[PDB]
Design a protein around this ligand. Structure first.
Ligand SMILES: Cc1cc2nc3c(=O)[nH]c(=O)nc-3n(C[C@H](O)[C@H](O)[C@H](O)COP(=O)(O)O)c2cc1C
Ligand SMILES: Cc1cc(Nc2ccc3ccccc3c2)[n+]2[nH]c[nH+]c2n1
Ligand SMILES: CCCCCCCCCCCC[N+](C)(C)[O-]
Ligand SMILES: O=C(O)c1cc(=O)[nH]c(=O)[nH]1
Length: 375
């Protein structure tokens, strides 16, 4: 397969010599120009999955922070992913923290970043997503692919809820689901919104603004929800792994009380302090070193919520084996980020095949039968 082969060489070269932020922006640009490879294969019917009435053609998507501004949605999806989470976006554009702000360690397959929500802002990203949605209805390869939107707050915003409401009113119509980001480590005081009291008020406000989209509209649903589901976006919350047991219990109760549609487990961590090349660096850590921590977090929340809240897995997923660990722990779907950095354009094709072979040799009829089996 020549196209993937050439890109693997170029990506390995880029890893060794070129700055990480430069690399990421380079490949986003190549995707914008539509010169990345395609995965046009039919996905196994036995690896499809869902979160409530939200259907995924396969269980692998791209996590938030990868295409922050929705400039590259088509090409990333056509690598073989069933969905992508754009953002995190904020109402106003931000430059983020000072460069350099992302570093990679190849041997440990780990990353550390201190971006601080650099993004073009809700208005510009909304225009980008609208353009995608128009392209989607004329491209055979984009049908049934899901696009979620991660939302957060500007660095100097004091009322997070005011920022979340603004983003929902601008972009909610074009999103299949909304991810509430209260777990970034690179914006001071954001994670404090995971406290049960603050979190509950945030979720209810978010759900209220989404419900208010449908009200005061004269068109049929088919023209209000310009997304993939043609329904109002589901609501997820992304949690950080840096919490004590009691905090995790209180959060679990809030999710059940508010009837949230799902939880993303998890964001980056600050606990990792054994990566030599990162010892002087600032930010949250991604990649392999995060896998075990995040998989445990999945098991815990699956228990604390009594299996009632669907889970989106994020953290150190590189192989089909890694994916099955997340699924057997309680996850319904998996998100990749670091895998794309170190494995390149073949990440989706490769990991989908590995998971299919593993579901068979493990004696599963389909993916859904494996959800939560470890417990
Ligand atoms: C450079 C970078 C930027 C990220 N930006 C976001 C973001 O904007 N919003 C978010 O919810 N998570 C963000 N993340 C976290 C990832 O979405 C993901 O949850 C985390 O990296 C763990 O996945 P992984 O181990 O497969 O990389 C970012 C991660 C990295 C490395
Ligand atoms: C070599 C490399 C790539 C990369 N980012 C990638 C990888 C894969 C992509 C596929 C499609 C579109 C954009 C992509 C961006 N990063 N990121 C942070 N360091 C780093 N190093
Ligand atoms: C370097 C390899 C070139 C890849 C060509 C782009 C493939 N595609 C699917 C966009 O046509
Ligand atoms: O924008 C960032 O710096 C960022 C956000 C986030 O949610 N997670 C992360 O690791 N970095």
């Amino acid at each position: 397969n020549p196209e993937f082969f050439l890109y693997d060489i170029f990506l390995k070269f880029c890893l060794k010599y070129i700055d990480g932020e430069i690399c990421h922006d380079l490949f986003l640009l190549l995707g914008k120009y539509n010169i990345l490879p395609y995965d046009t294969s039919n996905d196994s019917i036995y690896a499809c999955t869902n979160i409530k009435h939200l259907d995924f053609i396969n269980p692998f998507g791209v996590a938030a922070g990868f295409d922050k501004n929705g400039v590259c949605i088509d090409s990333i999806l056509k690598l073989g992913f069933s969905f992508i989470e754009i953002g995190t976006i904020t109402p106003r554009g931000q430059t983020g923290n000072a460069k350099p702000r992302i570093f990679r360690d190849v041997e440990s397959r780990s990353i550390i970043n201190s971006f601080g929500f650099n993004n073009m802002g809700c208005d510009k990203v909304t225009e980008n997503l609208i353009l995608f949605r128009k392209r989607q209805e004329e491209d055979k390869l984009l049908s049934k692919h899901i696009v979620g939107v991660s939302i957060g707050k500007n660095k100097d915003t004091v009322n997070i809820v005011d920022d979340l409401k603004y983003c929902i009113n601008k972009i909610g119509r074009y999103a299949d689901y909304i991810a509430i980001n209260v777990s970034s480590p690179n914006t001071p005081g954001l994670r404090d919104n995971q406290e049960a009291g603050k979190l509950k008020n945030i979720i209810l406000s978010v759900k209220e603004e989404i419900d208010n989209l449908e009200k005061n509209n004269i068109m049929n649903d088919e023209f209000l929800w310009f997304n993939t589901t043609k329904k109002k976006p589901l609501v997820f919350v992304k949690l950080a792994p840096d919490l004590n047991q009691e905090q995790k219990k209180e959060i679990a109760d809030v999710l059940l009380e508010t009837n949230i549609d799902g939880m993303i487990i998890s964001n980056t961590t600050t606990q990792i302090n054994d990566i030599k090349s990162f010892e002087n660096k600032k930010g949250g850590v991604s990649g392999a070193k995060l896998k075990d921590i995040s998989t445990k977090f999945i098991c815990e929340m699956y228990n604390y919520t009594n299996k009632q809240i669907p889970i989106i897995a994020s953290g150190g997923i590189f192989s089909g084996l890694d994916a099955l660990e997340k699924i057997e722990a309680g996850a319904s779907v998996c998100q990749l980020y670091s895998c794309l950095v170190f494995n390149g354009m073949k990440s989706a094709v490769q990991i989908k095949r590995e998971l299919n072979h593993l579901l068979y040799q493990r004696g599963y009829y389909n993916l859904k039968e494996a959800i939560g089996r470890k417990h």
